[PDB]
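pipeline/complex-builder :: batch 7 item 3
reading input block
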Amino acid sequence: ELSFGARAELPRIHPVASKLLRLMQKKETNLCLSADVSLARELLQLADALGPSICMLKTHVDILNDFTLDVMKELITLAKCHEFLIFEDRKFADIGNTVKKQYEGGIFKIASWADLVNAHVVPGSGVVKGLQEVGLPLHRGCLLIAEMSSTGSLATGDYTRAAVRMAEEHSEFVVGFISGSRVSMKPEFLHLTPGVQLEAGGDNLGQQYNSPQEVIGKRGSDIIIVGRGIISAADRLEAAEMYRKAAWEAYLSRLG
Amino acid sequence: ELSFGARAELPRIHPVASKLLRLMQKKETNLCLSADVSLARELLQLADALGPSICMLKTHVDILNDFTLDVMKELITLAKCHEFLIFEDRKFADIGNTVKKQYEGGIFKIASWADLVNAHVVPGSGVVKGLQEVGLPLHRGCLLIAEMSSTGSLATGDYTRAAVRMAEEHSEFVVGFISGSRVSMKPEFLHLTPGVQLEAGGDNLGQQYNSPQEVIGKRGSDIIIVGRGIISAADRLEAAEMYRKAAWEAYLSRLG
């Protein structure tokens, strides 16, 4: 059960995973900040302050009120300074030929700025297909949503197994999973887990939370995706650091 | 087996489904055009040329390079003029909380112009709880993706089954399904089947096609979603008419 640094250096390691792993190990952070905010200013301000604490800033540009390509440029600037990956959490879930367009074009041009995107496995491997056609090219990686944090989530049993197969049979482009838990023994593969807060509980629309220590330490995940847990806090930085220090020790404690 | 005119008049019918069913009848058309083009101009030109022939125009506003809300306004103008519904094939598939913003907000403000949207049930009912919070207000309907035309789709059995329960426990918002077949016995529920072409075939990236006769007559669906079968045709107007007539006649033969 290697460290992050050792994993970055694994043989079958999408350059995005390694890039990611090299900075988790380097920055002592397995914290992905879910920058769910509607205002480019906020997005960017959290990205800056929180960047050195994070390994990944996750975005929903389709949630961004003042979205412009210029905003991703800036987002990339900070991603590069503070060294975190940009993950656009577009949860692609259409047929190959559509996601292709959805990833590459329209106004979002996700592919031109998102190191990682994720995709739902429902549509079948074609979803990965359509995206790789855009992503592989532009040197991008994808997370497959193998489990979901939310109640009723039908990413279970053989859905999850299928997300795993899909990722394995596409390791060229899939760099990991969105899952609540570790789900591939293949340590080449990242586990990012949403539904993480320091306290217990959920939210009104179906979200379910677990502690970093539970997720990383016990459930064997790599990286915690944390939104309101931090964003809603007053001092998002303090929060981030609390989230950082938490996922990091859970991780260290697992490895020991 | 009720006619569209009849079905529009149903007790548990969503206002939107009848606006739709009412015009399917009036106009002798169960065809939904999948306007998978990327230029507003072509979207609008198609809507206009082809709205006499369609009950609905399905969009991916996020494929649209020159998307503005003004274009959607022009689309609505043509939706009112020619009388079709606008269905944005957004396939929401996130936790309740995220989808809300994705549907209401960001630069698309889908709900301000989308009579219809659809979502995947994989997150669990949160996605529909999240969507309806924006949607019931605006008088919008939602389809739940219970099956997919795509190869290796993971919407099968208890997944497809879930999608139905979810629909039925949200009939307030869910006007129906994206499915390959009729999936609900509840006639209030629209079935809109994509992966439709006159000729047998598919694509590279996992699309599979069935004929209007197959989808509507045999599999029990109401509306066909037809993109490339029409759009790539040279005389799109004659194409739509073929698909119109095929889908209309298949329905007529099933009603018979």
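note: The beta strands of chain B are 31-34, 56-59, 85-92, 116-120, 141-145, 174-178, 190-193, 223-226.
queue -> next item
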